[PDB]
Amino acid sequence: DVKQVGYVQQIIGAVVDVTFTDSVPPVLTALTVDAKETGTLLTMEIVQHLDTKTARCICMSSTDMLRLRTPVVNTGSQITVPVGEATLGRIFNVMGDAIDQRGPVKNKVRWPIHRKAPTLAEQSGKDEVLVTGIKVIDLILPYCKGGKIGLFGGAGVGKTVIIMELINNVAKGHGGYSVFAGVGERTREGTDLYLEMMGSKVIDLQGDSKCVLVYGQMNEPPGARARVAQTALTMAEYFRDEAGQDVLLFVDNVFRFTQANSEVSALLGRIPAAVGYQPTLAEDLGMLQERITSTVKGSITSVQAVYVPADDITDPAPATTFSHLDATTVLSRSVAEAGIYPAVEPLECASRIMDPDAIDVNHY
Amino acid sequence: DVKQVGYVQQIIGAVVDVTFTDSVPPVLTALTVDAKETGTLLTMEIVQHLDTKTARCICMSSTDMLRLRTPVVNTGSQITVPVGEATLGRIFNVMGDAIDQRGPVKNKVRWPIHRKAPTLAEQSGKDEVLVTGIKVIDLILPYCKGGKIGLFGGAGVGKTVIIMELINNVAKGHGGYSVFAGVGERTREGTDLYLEMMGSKVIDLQGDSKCVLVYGQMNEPPGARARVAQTALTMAEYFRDEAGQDVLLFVDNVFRFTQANSEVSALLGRIPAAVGYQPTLAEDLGMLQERITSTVKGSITSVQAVYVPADDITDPAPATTFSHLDATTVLSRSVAEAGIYPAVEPLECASRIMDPDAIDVNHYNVAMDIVEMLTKYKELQDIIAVLGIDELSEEDKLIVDRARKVAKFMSQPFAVAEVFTGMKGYYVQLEDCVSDFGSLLMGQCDNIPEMAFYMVGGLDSVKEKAAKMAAEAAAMRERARKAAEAK
Amino acid sequence: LEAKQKIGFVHGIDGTIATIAPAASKVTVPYNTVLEIAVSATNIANALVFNLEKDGSIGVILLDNISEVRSGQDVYATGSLLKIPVGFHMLGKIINPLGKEIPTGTKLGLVEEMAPNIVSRQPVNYNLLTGYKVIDTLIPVGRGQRELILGDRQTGKTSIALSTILNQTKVNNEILSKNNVLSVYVSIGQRCSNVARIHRLLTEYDAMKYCTIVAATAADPAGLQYLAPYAGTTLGEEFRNSGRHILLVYDDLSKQAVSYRQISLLLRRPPGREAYPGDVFYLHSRLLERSAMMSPQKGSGSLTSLPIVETLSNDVTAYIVTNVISITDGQIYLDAKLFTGGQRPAVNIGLSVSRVGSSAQNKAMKKVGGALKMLMGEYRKMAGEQTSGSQNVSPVMIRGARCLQLFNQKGPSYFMDAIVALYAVTNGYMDDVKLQYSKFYEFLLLNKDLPVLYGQVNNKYFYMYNKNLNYFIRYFGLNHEILEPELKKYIEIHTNLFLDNYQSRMNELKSDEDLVQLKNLLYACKRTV
Amino acid sequence: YDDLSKQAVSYRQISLLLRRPPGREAYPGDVFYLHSRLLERSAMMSPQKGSGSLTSLPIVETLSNDVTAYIVTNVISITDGQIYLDAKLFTGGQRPAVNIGLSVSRVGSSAQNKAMKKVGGALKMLMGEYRKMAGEQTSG
Amino acid sequence: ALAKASAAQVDWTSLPAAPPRPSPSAPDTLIRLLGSVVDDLADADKVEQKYG
Amino acid sequence: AGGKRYDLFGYEVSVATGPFIEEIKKAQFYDDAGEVIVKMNLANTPPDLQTYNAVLERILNCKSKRSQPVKGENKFAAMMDILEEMDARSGIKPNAESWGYVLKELVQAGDFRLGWVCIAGMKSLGITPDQALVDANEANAAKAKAAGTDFPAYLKKAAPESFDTKAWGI
Amino acid sequence: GNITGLMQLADYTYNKTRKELITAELLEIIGTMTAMHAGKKVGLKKTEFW
Ligand SMILES: Nc1ncnc2c1ncn2[C@@H]1O[C@H](COP(=O)(O)OP(=O)(O)OP(=O)(O)O)[C@@H](O)[C@H]1O
Ligand SMILES: Nc1ncnc2c1ncn2[C@@H]1O[C@H](COP(=O)(O)OP(=O)(O)OP(=O)(O)O)[C@@H](O)[C@H]1O
Ligand SMILES: Nc1ncnc2c1ncn2[C@@H]1O[C@H](COP(=O)(O)OP(=O)(O)O)[C@@H](O)[C@H]1O
Ligand SMILES: [Mg+2]
Ligand SMILES: [Mg+2]
Numbered sequence A: 001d002v003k004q005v006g007y008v009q010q011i012i013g014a015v016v017d018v019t020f021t022d023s024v025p026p027v028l029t030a031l032t033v034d035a036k037e038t039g040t041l042l043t044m045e046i047v048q049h050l051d052t053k054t055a056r057c058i059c060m061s062s063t064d065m066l067r068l069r070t071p072v073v074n075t076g077s078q079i080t081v082p083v084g085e086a087t088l089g090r091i092f093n094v095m096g097d098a099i100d101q102r103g104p105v106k107n108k109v110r111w112p113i114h115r116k117a118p119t120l121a122e123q124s125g126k127d128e129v130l131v132t133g134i135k136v137i138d139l140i141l142p143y144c145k146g147g148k149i150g151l152f153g154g155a156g157v158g159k160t161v162i163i164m165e166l167i168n169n170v171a172k173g174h175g176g177y178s179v180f181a182g183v184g185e186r187t188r189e190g191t192d193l194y195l196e197m198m199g200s201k202v203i204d205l206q207g208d209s210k211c212v213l214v215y216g217q218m219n220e221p222p223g224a225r226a227r228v229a230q231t232a233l234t235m236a237e238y239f240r241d242e243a244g245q246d247v248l249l250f251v252d253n254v255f256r257f258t259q260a261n262s263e264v265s266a267l268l269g270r271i272p273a274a275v276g277y278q279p280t281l282a283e284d285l286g287m288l289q290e291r292i293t294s295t296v297k298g299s300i301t302s303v304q305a306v307y308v309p310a311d312d313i314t315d316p317a318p319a320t321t322f323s324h325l326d327a328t329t330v331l332s333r334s335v336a337e338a339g340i341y342p343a344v345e346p347l348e349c350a351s352r353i354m355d356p357d358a359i360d361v362n363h364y
Numbered sequence B: 001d002v003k004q005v006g007y008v009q010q011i012i013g014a015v016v017d018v019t020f021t022d023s024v025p026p027v028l029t030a031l032t033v034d035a036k037e038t039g040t041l042l043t044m045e046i047v048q049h050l051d052t053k054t055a056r057c058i059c060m061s062s063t064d065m066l067r068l069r070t071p072v073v074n075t076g077s078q079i080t081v082p083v084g085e086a087t088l089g090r091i092f093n094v095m096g097d098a099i100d101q102r103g104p105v106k107n108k109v110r111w112p113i114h115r116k117a118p119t120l121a122e123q124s125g126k127d128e129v130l131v132t133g134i135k136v137i138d139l140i141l142p143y144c145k146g147g148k149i150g151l152f153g154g155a156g157v158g159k160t161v162i163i164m165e166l167i168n169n170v171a172k173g174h175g176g177y178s179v180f181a182g183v184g185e186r187t188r189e190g191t192d193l194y195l196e197m198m199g200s201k202v203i204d205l206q207g208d209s210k211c212v213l214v215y216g217q218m219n220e221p222p223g224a225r226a227r228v229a230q231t232a233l234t235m236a237e238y239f240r241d242e243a244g245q246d247v248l249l250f251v252d253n254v255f256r257f258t259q260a261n262s263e264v265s266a267l268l269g270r271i272p273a274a275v276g277y278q279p280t281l282a283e284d285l286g287m288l289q290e291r292i293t294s295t296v297k298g299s300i301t302s303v304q305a306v307y308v309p310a311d312d313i314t315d316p317a318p319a320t321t322f323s324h325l326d327a328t329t330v331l332s333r334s335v336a337e338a339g340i341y342p343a344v345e346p347l348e349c350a351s352r353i354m355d356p357d358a359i360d361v362n363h364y365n366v367a368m369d370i371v372e373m374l375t376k377y378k379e380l381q382d383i384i385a386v387l388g389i390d391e392l393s394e395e396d397k398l399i400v401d402r403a404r405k406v407a408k409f410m411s412q413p414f415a416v417a418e419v420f421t422g423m424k425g426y427y428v429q430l431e432d433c434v435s436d437f438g439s440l441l442m443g444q445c446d447n448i449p450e451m452a453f454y455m456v457g458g459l460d461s462v463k464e465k466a467a468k469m470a471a472e473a474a475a476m477r478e479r480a481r482k483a484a485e486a487k
Numbered sequence C: 001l002e003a004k005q006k007i008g009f010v011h012g013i014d015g016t017i018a019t020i021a022p023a024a025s026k027v028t029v030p031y032n033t034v035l036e037i038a039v040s041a042t043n044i045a046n047a048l049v050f051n052l053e054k055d056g057s058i059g060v061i062l063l064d065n066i067s068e069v070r071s072g073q074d075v076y077a078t079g080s081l082l083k084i085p086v087g088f089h090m091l092g093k094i095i096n097p098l099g100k101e102i103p104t105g106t107k108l109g110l111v112e113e114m115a116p117n118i119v120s121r122q123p124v125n126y127n128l129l130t131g132y133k134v135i136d137t138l139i140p141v142g143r144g145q146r147e148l149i150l151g152d153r154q155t156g157k158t159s160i161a162l163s164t165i166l167n168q169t170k171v172n173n174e175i176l177s178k179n180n181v182l183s184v185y186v187s188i189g190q191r192c193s194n195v196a197r198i199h200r201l202l203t204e205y206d207a208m209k210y211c212t213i214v215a216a217t218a219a220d221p222a223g224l225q226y227l228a229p230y231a232g233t234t235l236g237e238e239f240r241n242s243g244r245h246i247l248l249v250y251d252d253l254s255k256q257a258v259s260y261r262q263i264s265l266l267l268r269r270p271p272g273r274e275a276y277p278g279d280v281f282y283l284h285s286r287l288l289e290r291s292a293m294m295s296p297q298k299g300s301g302s303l304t305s306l307p308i309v310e311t312l313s314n315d316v317t318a319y320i321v322t323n324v325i326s327i328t329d330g331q332i333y334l335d336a337k338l339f340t341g342g343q344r345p346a347v348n349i350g351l352s353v354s355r356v357g358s359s360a361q362n363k364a365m366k367k368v369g370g371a372l373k374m375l376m377g378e379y380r381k382m383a384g385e386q387t388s389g390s391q392n393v394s395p396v397m398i399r400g401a402r403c404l405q406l407f408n409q410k411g412p413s414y415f416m417d418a419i420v421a422l423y424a425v426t427n428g429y430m431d432d433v434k435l436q437y438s439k440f441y442e443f444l445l446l447n448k449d450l451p452v453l454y455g456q457v458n459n460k461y462f463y464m465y466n467k468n469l470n471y472f473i474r475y476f477g478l479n480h481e482i483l484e485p486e487l488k489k490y491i492e493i494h495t496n497l498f499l500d501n502y503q504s505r506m507n508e509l510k511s512d513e514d515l516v517q518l519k520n521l522l523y524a525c526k527r528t529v
Numbered sequence D: 001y002d003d004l005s006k007q008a009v010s011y012r013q014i015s016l017l018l019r020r021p022p023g024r025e026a027y028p029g030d031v032f033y034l035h036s037r038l039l040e041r042s043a044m045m046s047p048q049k050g051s052g053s054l055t056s057l058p059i060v061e062t063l064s065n066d067v068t069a070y071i072v073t074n075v076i077s078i079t080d081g082q083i084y085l086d087a088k089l090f091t092g093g094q095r096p097a098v099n100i101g102l103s104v105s106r107v108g109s110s111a112q113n114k115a116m117k118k119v120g121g122a123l124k125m126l127m128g129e130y131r132k133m134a135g136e137q138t139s140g
Numbered sequence E: 001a002l003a004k005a006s007a008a009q010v011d012w013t014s015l016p017a018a019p020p021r022p023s024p025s026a027p028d029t030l031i032r033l034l035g036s037v038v039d040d041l042a043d044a045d046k047v048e049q050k051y052g
Numbered sequence F: 001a002g003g004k005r006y007d008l009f010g011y012e013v014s015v016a017t018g019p020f021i022e023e024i025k026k027a028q029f030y031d032d033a034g035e036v037i038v039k040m041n042l043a044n045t046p047p048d049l050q051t052y053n054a055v056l057e058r059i060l061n062c063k064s065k066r067s068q069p070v071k072g073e074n075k076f077a078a079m080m081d082i083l084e085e086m087d088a089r090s091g092i093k094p095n096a097e098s099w100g101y102v103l104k105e106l107v108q109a110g111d112f113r114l115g116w117v118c119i120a121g122m123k124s125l126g127i128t129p130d131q132a133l134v135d136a137n138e139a140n141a142a143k144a145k146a147a148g149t150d151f152p153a154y155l156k157k158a159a160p161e162s163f164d165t166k167a168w169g170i
Numbered sequence G: 001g002n003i004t005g006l007m008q009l010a011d012y013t014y015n016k017t018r019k020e021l022i023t024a025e026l027l028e029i030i031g032t033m034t035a036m037h038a039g040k041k042v043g044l045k046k047t048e049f050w
């Protein structure tokens, strides 16, 4: 059939307005401009309506050399990304496009990145200790298989290193497909991780790979960092639902997911909340968190890192993130300055499985 | 003859915008919306204008099921409220509508709610002390009849309880009348107060009452909770001006009046001032505080409560209330957590009629000597916490013990606190309240122990308690001996 | 027959909220009423009016099927407030605040109503046994009362309320269905898994017959998180008006304030302090003044409220916290310094009060709580001292510490099983034992009757096995002629048998195996008792 | 002036309701200039100008002994000295309850009389020493 | 929609709830025969009702 | 034809209570009787002593609380909760007839110890029991005495000589 | 020496928190003024274009 066409209206940053003559598509619909004009492909998801015959939409790639009367094309669907075993041992962008220069991903189906959370009937919380081998993490805040984890720490305290240690201990001897979401952290680290795993045969390209990599880093604009965590969750939810298999979800980190949505909310014109965050922060973060659950079909054991600017927990982003997790691991700087590493503050930490019903009585 | 009608423009929360073709009415004028559409008479009040055709307004009743373009009737007058003897022994709303199910109100006259403050000539400051029965107040903050009082304090300190006790002691003995204004109070405290005034027969329906009760509570919207204190003053200034009587005006509390207009200032479009308050706070409060004042005709002996959020005195609402009072009573968490009630900090509070000439000289000197003593007492906790009691002179240890005894002695049980204290309240007379502090001031009672002063009234009650504690100590001593004899 | 009335078309949509464009001019929409949005020929998206404007546009809160909303959809109007189904048929269910049931594995009630006026409510006379000794003795909660639960994250805020819900069950199966107190657990902005575990907990202890759960998760729209606690109180309406009793548990109300902030700011209301609109006090005021103990004219019903507010770094200076302490009668302050410091529930008594007091709690509890207040006021002044006079320790320093041990629990405690443990303290029968064995004592005092075992049965009736003496204790009181002497001639024998047979063996342990075994026993005693 | 701290609240009210741009403590920018319009009118005039004089005793209420406040900062920046009263001394029988170290007169001696310079110059040399001794000595 | 809702309501896989059971109220003759054992047997009955 | 009653707020109050007591006696399950108290109280007719005793009769003589059975039913506890609603809440005080209904149940329930509590409480309030019930209480006591049912059996068994979290049953 | 080491940190965090509280109050006021600017409408601007 014929494709709908719309024409740009105004541009303020990565945010764009588009005039749709007939009618506007639903929210989260993607919108594409050919690379003839801008020079590169540019997909743009709708996020809100301004009036009839108009839609406001954020861009993924940069808006450089974008004009005000450019033909935009309605794809007719959300941002679809690949799924399956073909997604294993490959690095992916926000748009689902592979960047590791290997070859065409042999996907069969693509799923959207935005999705309704599981129903209360599907959730099944089984409490089982996750032996990390790390010593503070076991006693004080014992992790839970299928539960969520939070590494809450400032700049230079050691949350990224804890993640690497968990990968070497947990992920390799996991027997389930792992996922690594880089969200506004160092691109350097993604290179080192791809090589740390390609040498450990976790990303064996001539064989069976047990890993998926997704990297929207800090160089990328907020339109990408704001929608890359969802892209990793699609990859993991396929293995949770279809395969019915246990998976790991390492996020590094969600504070830049929050930053990106804030940097956007400024461009959208929404009135900001306190310290300068978006009003919809709790909602935007919950729509992400509650997708990370362990259903009857499978289980997702997440390891989310979080950044605390100026060493402030009262920052609304971590403060909201506490209520969504099973094991809080609050790191410190003064502890790190004292030579202790991992710089855990056990008084601030907490866990859910820390009851005699789950862990044995002596450990409690 | 006909009353002009106006049509609504927009409704945002409690704020409404009304059109008026011919001309807009005065400010503070009332505006009825008939109950045919929303089920209840939705009265509204103009706060400001916007245009020669338009003016926005507040609603003291909840705007629900209210269409746009509804007719809005100009009453031609602001909120008329009833006044008289028939207002006595009845619960009233902001509009003067009686919410208790006792029947209609007889009213020969009905005064408005906003009125100009008394001119400087009309005022009259007569230095005359009020006997509360409370033991801190009668010394450091001797309340002046016809003056203004403020029970500043956070949450959980006893300001409401002090009001209940002051009602119990003053209002009974007050041959004039009394008025209570609940402003953002809890709806439960209204029951306790009404049932007390009925049990105490302050409110005697078959007989004659001497207490008006007005209630605009936490459940009500801001336009009601703001226009309550003015309602109570319509009640009180009648008894002052016309009847010439003396009046009591209890208020719980002045701070909810403030934030009721703060909740609307953003909707009005007024730029907010600092901590989140309206810019017109000081002026708006002054227009009410000045109405509370004695005149040549009569005397309102008001009492006010104030909420100090987070126990921060620097909040501009309390700080602006300082100027508008004569007895700035202050309560503190630190005294309350120590088991001392009323949790008054005598150093942070000071009255106006604490003079040498207005009151007795012995009273003044004893009070200032105690204030002077507790200052040093603070300076010595600051040392004993560090060094120890052994690092102080015997003359210094003496005033430590005396201040430690005055702090515990100025506690007092109240008849209202029978539930919490488990003990009957004591009424302490002013004359008895000076020969007991002054005695303790010059070492006349240093042999008496410390806890004997805790939660009692006068000095005669002490020696009763101390004689007891001697007996209940001898019991454990001799019972220890008989325990040794048995085994 | 039934023709739906349309008012306009959808102009804009910003996430959870929308802006309507009216069709005609003479059309007029009410305020706070529900609207409908024809997202499809089949389905409908409910909504609510939050603003009206000089342009005729309408600021709208959306509540269902938001993803199916577009611009230009036909918008209809019911001309009625938001309502939900109400009745006894809802007990034993989890329910969307719109009344829709959440699966697991006629009547309509207004969501916003005025509160009971100053004549239509009776003062607090009767109690609500939360099951914890600090809250039954020193912070007496009553019916028609609203008492906050403050605390930093992960301190026991949720668990006090759940344990209240679990304590009431045994009684409700014994007493008639008029004096039973039902419950409602409102989860605003929580995680859906926490709700599942709560459902399973209540279902284990069979507390779900007398409980409904109003779930508004984090993924749910902010308007739904906003109107959740109103749905809970809306169910409490019927049990008030049907003369019954009911309990409310508003899980975090701060999360109900973030939602109101989200709504108001996205609808271009002016912000205020901490970015809230300003009238967020009136919000919780409307919610919480609906709690009352209703007059006998109105059935002598009630609804208690246990709102919860999260706290950051143990401050009580945040906006919403002060806005709620202002409203609620009392507060149960839970300090992480004490939670982390060992004791659970981590109630801080210096900052936790109740503005009802003896009038709520029981005749048998008045005389014990009035003793514990004196004792703790005296122990508060001395307990800072590292005990130097080990044998010269005051009796208060003994009794207070043993009472602190007794305060340590995990689950609710039966009324008969709580007093008899506190009576011994206040009267000093439990002074020769050491602190660490204060609960094993209690265990034997409540679940292993020693004099029945060792033959020292001279008491005619008074034994802790029957469990039906609670009602006689509750009515007559402990300081009564028929119950005082038998009580003492149970506890003194319990103490002597303990001190002789059990305490003696305990202090004779030297090995690490046996001492670790005895160690874990006392922790189990601290949990189960 | 009893007092200027309320005068600034009034200027705030006016300026905000008339939508002037706000600033620190919600005051506008020219509220320093507000008090400079006023206090500089105080002067000791010249013998070409009658040798008259206008003195000023502006009162400014602090809160919890704060002097970092905006208005206090400003008036101190404007005034030719200051007086600082303390409640901790007012309660201790010291009335007027100055704190002589924080209280300053940049006009030190040119105002004083011939009989006053010697006396007060000795009192400075007495109290500056009295504090170094009184501060270090014990309570006992 | 009526048909869809009705289909969603039913759970064939699940087992329908049994009638409510009253308190045991065991007789004195049972207890006199078996003093100390009835508690163990009731616990085992709960165990079997759950597992077996 | 009686002293007019008043609420705490001094409002006049109805006394026409008979039509409600009949609905109690016509009841068959003793939870509906409480509901009759409720529907009576909503109508500005507060319960009197006669009504509460009608309810205690209906409790004692009914078979079950509700139509279906309920776990945790205690025929005694409902009766002894009405007396707390009577003395404390409502201010009414029971009589010899009320405690009579109460003691009959402990005879039927065989709980002979709680009876003796009631026997003592009566005379501490001036009330005197019927010896037909006192003798039956003593009869149940003597039977349970000779039979070893004086206490339950789980109390009359030795405790773990060794401390162990499992042996004690926790 | 130690007490001084604590005193500098106390003075430092006191002033840090003081300044941050000031900045925060400003941004509250500016948020409100800005939101009102959004609330206010644009006019017509009718003039000859020919
Ligand atoms: N266990 C450890 N032993 C030694 N050094 C450590 C340890 N953990 C962390 N560090 C040191 O801390 C520094 C930062 O580690 P990491 O890369 O985790 O920082 P981060 O927590 O990710 O903070 P940011 O994201 O801001 O860089 C590095 O110098 C690292 O060597
Ligand atoms: N009295 C208690 N005894 C033993 N454990 C307790 C007690 N109270 C709370 N806990 C434990 O503390 C943990 C958290 O309790 P709760 O769920 O009430 O936290 P919370 O106050 O809801 O904090 P958050 O809302 O952030 O989860 C749980 O593991 C719970 O079992
Ligand atoms: N005179 C007193 N004696 C004992 N306790 C008191 C006294 N006054 C206040 N309290 C305690 O303070 C609590 C709150 O009193 P209240 O007057 O309601 O506080 P507020 O005035 O701040 O609302 C009471 O519930 C009680 O526990
Ligand atoms: Mg890092
Ligand atoms: Mg109060």
Ligand SMILES: [Mg+2]
Binding pocket: C157, C158, C251
């Ligand atoms: Mg919780």
